[PDB]
Design a protein around this nucleic acid. Structure first.
Ligand SMILES: [Cl-]
Ligand SMILES: [Cl-]
Ligand SMILES: [Cl-]
Ligand SMILES: [K+]
Ligand SMILES: [Mg+2]
Ligand SMILES: [Mg+2]
Ligand SMILES: [Mg+2]
Ligand SMILES: [Mg+2]
Ligand SMILES: [Mg+2]
Ligand SMILES: [Mg+2]
Ligand SMILES: [Mg+2]
Ligand SMILES: [Mg+2]
Ligand SMILES: [Mg+2]
Ligand SMILES: [Mg+2]
Ligand SMILES: [Mg+2]
Ligand SMILES: [Mg+2]
Ligand SMILES: [Mg+2]
Ligand SMILES: [Mg+2]
Ligand SMILES: [Mg+2]
Ligand SMILES: [Mg+2]
Ligand SMILES: [Mg+2]
Ligand SMILES: [Mg+2]
Ligand SMILES: [Mg+2]
Ligand SMILES: [Mg+2]
Ligand SMILES: [Mg+2]
Ligand SMILES: [Mg+2]
Ligand SMILES: [Mg+2]
Ligand SMILES: [Mg+2]
Ligand SMILES: [Mg+2]
Ligand SMILES: [Mg+2]
Ligand SMILES: [Mg+2]
Ligand SMILES: [Mg+2]
Ligand SMILES: [Mg+2]
Ligand SMILES: [Mg+2]
Ligand SMILES: [Mg+2]
Ligand SMILES: [Mg+2]
Ligand SMILES: [Mg+2]
Ligand SMILES: [Mg+2]
Ligand SMILES: [Mg+2]
Ligand SMILES: [Mg+2]
Ligand SMILES: [Mg+2]
Ligand SMILES: [Mg+2]
Ligand SMILES: [Mg+2]
Ligand SMILES: [Mg+2]
Ligand SMILES: [Mg+2]
Ligand SMILES: [Mg+2]
Ligand SMILES: [Mg+2]
Ligand SMILES: [Mg+2]
Ligand SMILES: [Mg+2]
Ligand SMILES: [Mg+2]
Ligand SMILES: [Mg+2]
Ligand code: NA
Ligand code: NA
Ligand code: NA
Ligand code: NA
Ligand code: NA
Ligand code: NA
Ligand code: NA
Ligand code: NA
Ligand code: NA
Ligand code: NA
Ligand code: NA
Ligand code: NA
Ligand code: NA
Ligand code: NA
Ligand code: NA
Ligand code: NA
Ligand code: NA
Ligand code: NA
Ligand code: NA
Ligand code: NA
Lengths: 73, 237, 56
RNA sequence: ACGACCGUAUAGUACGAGAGGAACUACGGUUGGUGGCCACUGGUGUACCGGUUGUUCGAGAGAGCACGUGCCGGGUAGCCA
RNA sequence: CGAGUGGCUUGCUACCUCGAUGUCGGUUCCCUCCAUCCUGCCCGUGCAGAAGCGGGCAAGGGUGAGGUUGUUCGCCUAUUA
RNA sequence: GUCGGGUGAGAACCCCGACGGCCUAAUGGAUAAGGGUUCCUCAGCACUGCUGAUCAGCUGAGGGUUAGCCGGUCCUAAGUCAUACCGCAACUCGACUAUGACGAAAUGGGAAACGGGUUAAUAUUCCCGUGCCACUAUGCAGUGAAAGUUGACGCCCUGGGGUCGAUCACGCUGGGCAUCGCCCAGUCGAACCGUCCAACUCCGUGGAAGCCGUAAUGGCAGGAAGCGGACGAACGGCGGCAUAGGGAAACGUGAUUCAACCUGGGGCCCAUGAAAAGACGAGCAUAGUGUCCGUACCGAGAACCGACACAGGUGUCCAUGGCGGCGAAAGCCAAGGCCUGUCGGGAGCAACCAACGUUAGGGAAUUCGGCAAGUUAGUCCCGUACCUUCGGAAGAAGGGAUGCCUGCUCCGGAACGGAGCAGGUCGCAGUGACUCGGAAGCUCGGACUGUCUAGUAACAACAUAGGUGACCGCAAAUCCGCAAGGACUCGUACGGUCACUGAAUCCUGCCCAGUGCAGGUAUCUGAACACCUCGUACAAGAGGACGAAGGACCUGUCAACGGCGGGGGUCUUAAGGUAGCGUAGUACCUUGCCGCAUCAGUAGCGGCUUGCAUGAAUGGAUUAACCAGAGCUUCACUGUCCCAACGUUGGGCCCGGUGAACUGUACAUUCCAGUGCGGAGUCUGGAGACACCCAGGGGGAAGCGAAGACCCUAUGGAGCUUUACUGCAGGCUGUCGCUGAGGACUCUCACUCCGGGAGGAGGACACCGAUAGCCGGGCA
RNA sequence: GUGGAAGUCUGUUAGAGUUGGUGUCCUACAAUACCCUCUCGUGAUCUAUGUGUAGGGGUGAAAGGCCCAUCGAGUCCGGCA
């Protein structure tokens, strides 16, 4: 997490880097199969190490609050 | 005095140009004779150096292989379609007329066939509100209500990469790396920190702008700096 | 770093060379233009009235 | 090329109700200055002698280098305070 | 209130230098002046003594160390004849 | 450097030997650029060489550079040019769009070479031997043949394969030493041809419901382990090459750690890490062809740039030689190089100066200030405060240990790896040299890493993430161009432009009167064309009607410029200073008052505070961490001081040789006084004064150096500013032309934009040309 | 315990920078040098070569810094006696 930043940058900056990255690094449930093996491959790029499915998602999350509204509408 | 930075920009010298030779593709909707039959398969997902957002590689039926402005939720193997009769699923592109009102859209054309102009940055989207035989009313990400020819093509879904702005850069070095991929001069020296000869706000025994910051629309380049034709300033009221 | 003597050390770059057209060591091999006769820039020969006094 | 001060005897005296408290003279010492000197104390002393680290000359012996002594201990003459 | 002496301060003047006479303070090293702080020799005292106060001759010698401040100046401390 | 010796007319410095030293990422080896013959030989010394020279990078004359397989050449990169088109008064000018070409010699991509030998000087080029590539021809094979693969790729961590080197063991060959028995060198052998294959991926078998596996992550009924198999690596192993070559000889075998090279796994990105030619895909024999350019040498304390044989500057590779140790560190030493960072001889070698060692007792008294110097130091164990953004503070502080020798234990496959134990033992001192922090506290500033005045400023200044406001829907906002056109932009509001503030934390009050910007606007003002009236047989001209932007007027707006007082229990001019902070890096009075601390403190810190003249993104307060930033205090330390001494090395002094410059109206042995344009060696009066020379520290020559930077003057200059004067770009707006049909409206045919086209959008507007009004330090 | 992040620390590794000494030099070795000290040293890092931007114009993390010893408007020649 934010520990790599030492005593630099201040509270908000690193509290948010940790928050974003913790969610970022959480196990994510693949859209194709249902296994929790989705890992970020880069900015907005996600992939399942199980089946290999490579998806377009948010920058730090595979699903964004807006991408979800799409499914409905 | 000397030309101000905003003036050095226009000359298009190396310092101010985008590293175009390093860019991948000019994201534009494919051209279809008609019928809509055109479909393709997503072959890969790549990073777009010009937008800090993902983009999708697609192989079309007629052999054409082109990168595409990827909405969120598109993955390898998916089949995308482009045409009047395209199914109504995310990742597909069709004219605003064939799109059901109330659906989020991206990469909207300004005029039919221009390949897409609006809503293309990370995580954004337009909102098709009203239909008609003459006008398709779309709400752009800025919040504006835009009247467009219903023949203007668009892509179903919101642009991928949403939430990019949520994380702070934290350090100068991170901005640096991003700035190196854009047509921009960075870092930025404040005008008031310069000499009178270099900027209208330059000079003085201490740092402060000489005159008021709100400048007229009619001001000539070299003088148009600060708050341009500001209808108001501050936060109060 | 001193702009004088110490900065003279990096000067091992070849620019002006013997020109094919006029024979002067003025053909800038980087620009491919002779600063003396204009070769590479002009079919006509480089020449100006200010190269001599006004009434001569 | 000597200036000045402190102390002792004078004297708990002269003076003075008392409290307190001199001097001449003779002494001892200090301080500042001055000139010289090295028996004494002290400094230096890459003269010298010893110890010892690293390395090289195979070991030993005996040595070089480590800034103009590698470092540490002792230190004659001389020069000095 | 009146008469002066000095040429350290300040002010005035604009004589000297603008083809340049290197600044303040400090330091180091030398000479000097006396309107004398100490020392010598004296006079007066509201001079008992002791300790002083004031004055005269006198420039031989001495007039030191520190805390704040760039300070000069000055304030402060302990020594001091 | 020294002693001998060689050559020579001549020898400190040219050569030989010995002895003594210097250089170890360089003072060695190979090279890029750049130089250009400086390379080698012979002959020389008038020139050059910091002295000399028989020497030479000097002078003269000759000689020297050999390529199918090393580079160039070919490809394409950022980008450049040429032609066409268009612009421009015009071009040797100019942007776009086409086409074509150019653009990499160490260091991008890339068909192919190794070993030995040889010259005074070349060498993967010549010679000997061997190998290899491409093209073409002949012949056999082959119909396949272009899909695909490769070329071809970022940063961080890491496993495995593995050669050289280094080291260890043992044998052989040669050498060194001479109380031992040790120590050193060698022990060789290519390209290429052939073969082997770990990792990855995949197949079959198998059938795990908890097992499999890693340094780590991980893997699996969507099929784990095991087993069998396909594909598949090295500049590596192995065999050939090789009764080749090389060596005086022996002409080894194993091992560990393993640069090169090969091949995997993991992690990171608001960053995504070239392209093209070419190769592979796609067999073999024989033969022919393989032209053109480069190739010497230096590559630097003498061959390059810096006027010089200049202590400066100048890229790449050798990063694996030994000891040492964490180490590409120090110190010492090999290989290799050098004694050319090129003037010597003499004096115990004085004064004085440069670097520097040691100084008793005191210990910052020195000083603006601890400037300078000193102290501490490596490693292990113990232990560690306030504060804090919980990361840090921290190596806080403080305490202890540390060598050698003998015998051992533990970890590990092992190391010539690491961690310990017991006993013995020497010194003043065991990180014994070397290498190697002094520590603690208070306050100010900027959050941090970063940037900067090349050459007196490194800071508190700039930047920054973060906070905020402004403009813009893309035929945009902003900006460049005279134009043709162009940057932003392979971009599209989660964008990018224009500004302000400057991490975090707690916060950010009141004012829209002036100024700025913006919106609105009954009425007022507001140009030109067209229109109406007068005038003129026409015209000039006067006047009217209409009225755009703009202005008046109204409104919004301060995280817009900025403002936040005097008086009384409102007045100027809108408000009248809120949270906070405060004698401030802002406080004149001022060394403010009180306290802390000291013998004594214009300093420093804390409190008070009526603030000459604090205050909220002109940001206020505050703040952990960081800092060659400013001030202060303590411990430690010490030649900074009391107060100086002695010593070391290089000079200085004498001698040989070489050999400048500054400066010079003249005269000149001066001193004390005076005078003089008031600051005299020279005038006047006196005094003193025999001449010349050496060394010294610099009192005077208002010493030398520079037509004063300060100041003023000149109807001097320049940069900068603005509501100075006058104009000029640019923006807005009306009008005319392009421009057409039927104070408001439709249409389509010019014209503009979108679309490959069909066609769609817009449309007499816009663009462009002309002109009029307003704004207009952007510029002159 | 493993793992090995960082505009992270120590560091004369290479390399970059340039704080103090107001040392040496100041007709220099040098028209910006020498020595000691000192800062950075995985990153907004340093660097070679190629390449682009040109004078009221560039370039500028902004010092009026830099654009060949030349900068509050380069250099050359001309206007110009
Ligand atoms: Cl950004
Ligand atoms: Cl070559
Ligand atoms: Cl692995
Ligand atoms: K003057
Ligand atoms: Mg594009
Ligand atoms: Mg980060
Ligand atoms: Mg850029
Ligand atoms: Mg800034
Ligand atoms: Mg400034
Ligand atoms: Mg200006
Ligand atoms: Mg400010
Ligand atoms: Mg400001
Ligand atoms: Mg310059
Ligand atoms: Mg020695
Ligand atoms: Mg003088
Ligand atoms: Mg008297
Ligand atoms: Mg006297
Ligand atoms: Mg030669
Ligand atoms: Mg000869
Ligand atoms: Mg080419
Ligand atoms: Mg190459
Ligand atoms: Mg040779
Ligand atoms: Mg050669
Ligand atoms: Mg030399
Ligand atoms: Mg002492
Ligand atoms: Mg003191
Ligand atoms: Mg003092
Ligand atoms: Mg110091
Ligand atoms: Mg074991
Ligand atoms: Mg030590
Ligand atoms: Mg203060
Ligand atoms: Mg800072
Ligand atoms: Mg400077
Ligand atoms: Mg600094
Ligand atoms: Mg400096
Ligand atoms: Mg700042
Ligand atoms: Mg900001
Ligand atoms: Mg932001
Ligand atoms: Mg911002
Ligand atoms: Mg105070
Ligand atoms: Mg405010
Ligand atoms: Mg006379
Ligand atoms: Mg003058
Ligand atoms: Mg002036
Ligand atoms: Mg002027
Ligand atoms: Mg067009
Ligand atoms: Mg002007
Ligand atoms: Mg760092
Ligand atoms: Mg460091
Ligand atoms: Mg360059
Ligand atoms: Mg300035
Ligand atoms: Na200003
Ligand atoms: Na003068
Ligand atoms: Na003085
Ligand atoms: Na006296
Ligand atoms: Na004082
Ligand atoms: Na010599
Ligand atoms: Na092989
Ligand atoms: Na070693
Ligand atoms: Na750093
Ligand atoms: Na106002
Ligand atoms: Na206003
Ligand atoms: Na204020
Ligand atoms: Na810094
Ligand atoms: Na000393
Ligand atoms: Na003198
Ligand atoms: Na000027
Ligand atoms: Na952990
Ligand atoms: Na320095
Ligand atoms: Na100019
Ligand atoms: Na002229």
């Amino acid at each position: 997490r934010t520990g790599r930043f030492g005593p630099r940058y201040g509270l908000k900056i690193r509290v948010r880097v940790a928050d974003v990255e913790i969610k970022h690094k959480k196990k994510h449930k693949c859209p194709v199969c249902g296994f929790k093996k989705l890992k970020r491959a880069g900015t907005g790029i996600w992939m399942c190490g199980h089946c290999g499915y490579k998806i377009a998602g948010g920058c730090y999350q595979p699903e964004t609050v807006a991408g979800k509204a799409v499914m409905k509408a | 005095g000397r030309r101000i930075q905003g003036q050095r920009r226009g000359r298009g010298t190396s310092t101010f140009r985008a590293p175009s030779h390093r860019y991948k593709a000019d994201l534009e909707h494919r051209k279809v004779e008609d019928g809509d039959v055109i479909a393709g398969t997503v072959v890969d997902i790549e990073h777009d150096p010009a937008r800090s957002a993902p983009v999708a590689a697609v192989e079309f039926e007629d052999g054409d292989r082109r990168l595409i402005l990827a909405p969120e939720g598109v993955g390898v193997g998916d089949e995308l379609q482009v045409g009047v009769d395209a199914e109504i699923a995310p990742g597909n592109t069709l004219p605003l007329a064939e799109i059901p009102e109330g659906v989020p859209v991206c990469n909207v054309e300004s005029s039919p066939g221009d390949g897409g102009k609006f809503a293309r940055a990370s995580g954004v989207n337009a909102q098709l509100l009203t239909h008609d035989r003459n006008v398709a009313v779309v709400k752009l990400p800025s919040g504006e209500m835009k009247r467009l020819d219903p023949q203007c093509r668009a892509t179903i879904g919101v642009v991928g990469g949403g939430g990019r702005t949520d994380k702070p850069f934290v350090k100068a070095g991170n901005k640096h790396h991003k700035m190196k991929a854009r047509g921009t001069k960075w870092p930025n020296v404040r005008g008031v920190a310069m000499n009178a000869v270099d900027h209208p706000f330059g000079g003085g025994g201490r740092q402060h702008p000489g005159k008021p910051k709100s400048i007229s629309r009619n001001a000539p380049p070299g003088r148009k700096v600060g708050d341009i034709a500001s209808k108001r300033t501050g936060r109060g009221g | 770093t001193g702009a004088g003597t110490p900065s003279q050390g990096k000067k091992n770059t070849t620019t002006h060379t013997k020109c094919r057209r006029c024979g002067e060591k003025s053909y800038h091999t980087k620009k491919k233009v002779c600063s003396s006769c204009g070769f590479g820039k002009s079919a006509k020969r480089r020449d100006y009235e200010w190269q001599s006094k006004a009434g001569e």
